[PDB]
């Protein structure tokens with residue numbers, strides 16, 4: 455049978471997961487920047 | 500026809516890896532978020 | 545139905561997503577690098 | 590088959606790169622978890 | 635309009651982008667590891 459439709463589906467699923475990855479990474483950078491600033495203001499340092 | 504069978508296989512393996520990457524990132528941001536909270540409550544700071 | 549047109553759009557979307565992922569990772573490495581150096585010169589250490 | 594052979598090779602290269610990204614991320618999570626436990630079990634905090 | 639040529643270019647771009655991601659990730663793991671060790675040798679803890 456024709457595997458093109460399934461190939462398109464795999465690509466669509468790839469983009470779905472990749473979009474989730476982008477959102478996670480985006481949040482993570484925010485958490486890391488917050489961690490950085492907090493450490494910068496650590497009196498012990 | 501064409502290398503459709505082979506290309507599909509590469510796409511499926513890629514999706515499987517991306518899904519794992521997604522879950523790894525998910526867990527990672529969690530750990531970072533915990534680390535962040537632990538530092539915010541660190542009396543040394 | 546020729547699916548090439550749709551597949552191409554998926555590939556383009558993938559690259560756009562990756563461009564964002566790369567930019568985010570680039571900024572994240574900079575934050576971590578700064579966090580590293582800050583902890584390195586921490587008084588209480 | 591036209592550019593099919595070349596496209597398949599790009600896909601294989603992509604899967605190889607992803608495997609490496611996965612292994613790197615798996616190592617990174619372990620370092621973050623250790624870091625998390627370290628700060629969590631810190632005395633000064 | 636034959637889209638294969640353009641599809642090949644997108645795939646090659648995905649690999650170029652992924653190589654950049656892998657490069658950034660390996661450097662990031664190094665920075666995170668340095669951070670981990672630095673905290674481990676931090677007297678304050």
Ligand SMILES: CCCCCCCCCCCCCCCCCC(=O)O
Pocket residue numbers: 465468472475479510513517520524527555558562565569600603607610614645648655659662
């Ligand atoms: C035609 C085939 C599809 C091509 C899609 C390629 C898959 C995209 C790979 C995405 C890799 C991103 C990994 C996350 C980056 C690491 C973030 C972190 O530091 O935690």
